């Protein structure tokens, strides 16, 4: 039937269509998403981070520390 209304059938089902592919969509956008929240993340780990550099900090203030114990 070449002659059949090729328009959209406006009276269609506009609902949610429960049978849609619920999988992961492996072809997506794997990039940086530049419009992402550029803020401080208040819920970050406020603890001590035990696995931190326990070394000597070779670049530290080698000066005289003028505010030191001036007593015996």
């Amino acid at each position, epitope marked *: 039937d070449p002659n059949a209304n090729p328009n959209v059938d406006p009276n269609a*089902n506009p*609902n*949610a*269509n*429960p*049978n*849609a*592919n*619920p*999988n*992961a969509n492996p072809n997506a956008n794997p990039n940086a998403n530049p419009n992402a929240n550029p803020n401080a993340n208040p819920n970050a780990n406020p603890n001590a981070n035990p696995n931190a550099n326990p070394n000597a900090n070779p670049n530290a203030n080698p000066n005289a520390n003028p505010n030191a114990n001036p007593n015996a």
Partner: antibody
Amino acid sequence: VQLVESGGGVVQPGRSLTLSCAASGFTFSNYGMHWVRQTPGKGLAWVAIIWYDGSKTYYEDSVKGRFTISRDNSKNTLYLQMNSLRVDDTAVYYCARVRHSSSRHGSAFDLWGQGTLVTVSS
Amino acid sequence: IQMTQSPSTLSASVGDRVTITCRASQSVSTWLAWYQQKPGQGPKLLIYEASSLESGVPSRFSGSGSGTEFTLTISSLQPDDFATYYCQQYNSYSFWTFGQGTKVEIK
């Protein structure tokens, strides 16, 4: 790969029961999963669906508002909180995984769990 | 859709040809799947989209049909093929519904 449920048992009518479904051997955060009943004397019946993210759920018409299906991608589990249980809900519950499909129409349930027995009686 | 499978129970021997007929109350296009459930286990997918074969299934299992008439054909029955078979549909705008399930028993 494997898919094993738990949390079954016997509870009185009106009580609340929580089921679990641990998935291993595959990337669990990639598949939308289903819960399927098996009442003896009747064929399988669908119960709920989880949309790979927890964003979309659809329930059977007889369990809307009494069943809550939710998933945790971090620990590879499923949960189906069942509230206001009735004597009708005595059936074995299965987990199902939706097959990968190269379209927008989903696919069948390929990986099924061994099923847990939930009994409601007085 | 209400899926009814006929015959309810069919008897067959090893190597005999078995055909199971599944019917749908409304058109489901080719969206239909078949399952095999041995007693005490969880059903295993055999055929998806009513024609394709799931990876790992033996070539014995086959299926064909479209619309409201579907059939499953086992060319040569085997001792491990005696289990209950279910007919599931997943239409475009309809939820998943399962059939009654036919049991293949030893003659």
